[PDB]
Write a protein that binds this ligand. Structure first.
Ligand SMILES: *[C@@H]1O[C@H](CO)[C@@H](O[C@@H]2O[C@H](CO)[C@@H](O)[C@H](O)[C@H]2NC(C)=O)[C@H](O)[C@H]1NC(C)=O
Ligand SMILES: *[C@@H]1O[C@H](CO)[C@@H](O[C@@H]2O[C@H](CO)[C@@H](O)[C@H](O)[C@H]2NC(C)=O)[C@H](O)[C@H]1NC(C)=O
Ligand SMILES: *[C@@H]1O[C@H](CO)[C@@H](O[C@@H]2O[C@H](CO)[C@@H](O)[C@H](O)[C@H]2NC(C)=O)[C@H](O)[C@H]1NC(C)=O
Ligand SMILES: *[C@@H]1O[C@H](CO)[C@@H](O[C@@H]2O[C@H](CO)[C@@H](O)[C@H](O)[C@H]2NC(C)=O)[C@H](O)[C@H]1NC(C)=O
Lengths: 48, 70
């Protein structure tokens, strides 16, 4: 949650979480603007 | 860091990399090695307006065209 996937290849590197989720969308073929303009929806859907 | 940069009322997002600030100026870097470059219109792409991104910051994105045309 605080370091993403960096602690498994060396030192834990902090990065804010909203930006971690944007990277993760990029890794599946979705552009990052789709998350940032819908951040509230994805957080509501995850929490439910 | 910041997710996007505002210029001319438009939101700019990095093609690859993250925005960083050294204390006084902002740069684009690749994510795996620190190597800053100036934020230009060839480094970024435009999508949406600066009203939907949380944490967007003001900066200058430089266009190479105008200083070539003096
Ligand atoms: C994408 O789908 C979601 C539902 O999966 C839509 O969100 C719902 O919209 C309805 C109608 O406004 C609301 O009553 C629900 O409360 C919303 N659900 C959640 C979890 O927020 C969303 O509007 C759709 N997006 C578009 C662009 O149509
Ligand atoms: C952040 O980096 C910049 C660029 O290196 C520093 O700003 C100065 O920028 C001018 C050009 O606009 C250069 O001619 C200077 O040599 C730069 N100074 C230095 C010390 O590099 C700026 O100082 C840096 N900020 C911090 C807080 O270190
Ligand atoms: C990150 O969190 C800090 C608090 O830990 C936020 O700082 C506050 O910002 C508000 C305005 O948004 C101020 O009214 C408060 O006084 C600030 N708190 C402190 C302790 O200085 C900061 O805004 C957050 N950053 C983002 C991008 O949301
Ligand atoms: C980033 O720059 C924009 C553009 O100058 C700022 O938008 C202005 O915001 C002020 C209030 O802070 C309004 O009075 C102006 O009308 C806005 N200008 C326009 C053209 O809409 C924005 O506030 C700046 N952001 C920060 C954090 O300073």
């Amino acid at each position: 949650i605080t370091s993403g996937w960096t602690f498994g290849a060396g030192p834990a590197l902090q990065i804010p979480f909203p930006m971690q989720m944007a990277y993760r969308f990029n890794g599946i073929g979705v552009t990052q603007n789709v998350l940032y303009e819908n951040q509230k929806l994805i957080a509501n859907q995850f929490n439910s | 860091t910041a997710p996007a940069i505002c210029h001319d009322g438009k939101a700019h997002f990095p093609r690859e990399g993250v925005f960083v600030s050294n204390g006084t100026h902002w740069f684009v870097t690749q994510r795996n090695f620190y190597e800053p470059q100036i934020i230009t219109t060839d480094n970024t792409f435009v999508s949406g307006n600066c009203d939907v991104v949380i944490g967007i910051v003001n900066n200058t994105v430089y266009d190479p065209l105008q200083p070539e045309l003096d």
